[PDB]
């Protein structure tokens, strides 16, 4: 009763939405390095035995339709559900290629009363996206709730930019995949994500020719409404 049942026939789906190029209606810069993230995540979750589905450059309409359709699948034989969102964002918002959609709208499809074959199962949302435009300068050293069993693993603190490297991928996804590869057979998920927080916080610092964007830091933000411990083994 302390840990989620993870020995269903299937670990579950891993949906990866990878938005790199955006319409001129929004403008918004192409997200160089995000293909590196998407590939890293595909391989990482393949090795965790998830059924990975990669999707590229979805409009906000397409994102909502995809989430709706997936929430209407029969997940009875699956232990869990994972959704990874790679895009531009603002607080509470992820961008389709043609504009913003509320994260709440995406999550709502998987509510305990709306996706019954996932009721009582962990629903993990992993979000690499800005959550605002602040920069961190750093410092020298018989019923269950319908909102239960969600985890939102954010790349960055609320209100803040999130950092992506054009060559290596985003700081958060780099670190997440590295910690999952090293510890998924040894540590509970919250402890893995805590290692990810440390890695991002300690091993990364921005380098920029623009002083305004130089020497900046990042701390990811784990938001858990899980009711049990989650082990991938």
């Amino acid at each position: 009763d302390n840990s989620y049942k993870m020995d269903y026939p299937e670990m579950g789906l891993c949906i990866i939405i990878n938005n790199k190029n955006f319409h001129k209606s929004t403008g918004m810069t192409s997200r160089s390095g995000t293909d590196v993230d998407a590939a890293n995540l595909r391989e990482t979750f393949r090795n965790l035995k998830y059924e990975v589905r990669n999707k590229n450059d979805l409009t906000r309409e397409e994102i909502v339709e995809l989430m709706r359709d997936v929430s209407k699948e029969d997940h009875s034989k699956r232990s869990s559900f994972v959704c990874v969102l790679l895009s531009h964002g603002e607080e509470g918002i992820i961008f389709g290629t043609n504009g913003p959609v509320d994260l709440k709208k995406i999550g709502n499809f998987f509510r305990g009363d709306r996706c019954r074959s996932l009721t009582g199962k962990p629903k993990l949302f992993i979000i690499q996206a800005c959550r605002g435009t602040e920069l961190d300068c750093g410092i020298e050293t018989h019923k269950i709730p319908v909102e239960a069993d969600f985890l939102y693993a954010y790349s960055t603190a609320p209100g803040y930019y999130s950092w992506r490297n054009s060559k290596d991928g985003s700081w958060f996804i780099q670190s997440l995949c590295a910690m999952l590869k090293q510890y998924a057979d040894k540590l509970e998920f919250m402890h893995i994500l805590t290692r990810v927080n440390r890695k991002v916080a300690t091993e990364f610092e921005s380098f920029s020719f623009d002083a305004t964007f130089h020497a900046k830091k990042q701390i990811p933000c784990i938001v858990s409404m899980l009711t049990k411990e989650l082990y991938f083994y």
Partner: peptide, 5 residues
């Protein structure tokens, strides 16, 4: 792959 339906 990538892009799976």
């Amino acid at each position: 792959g990538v892009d799976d339906d």
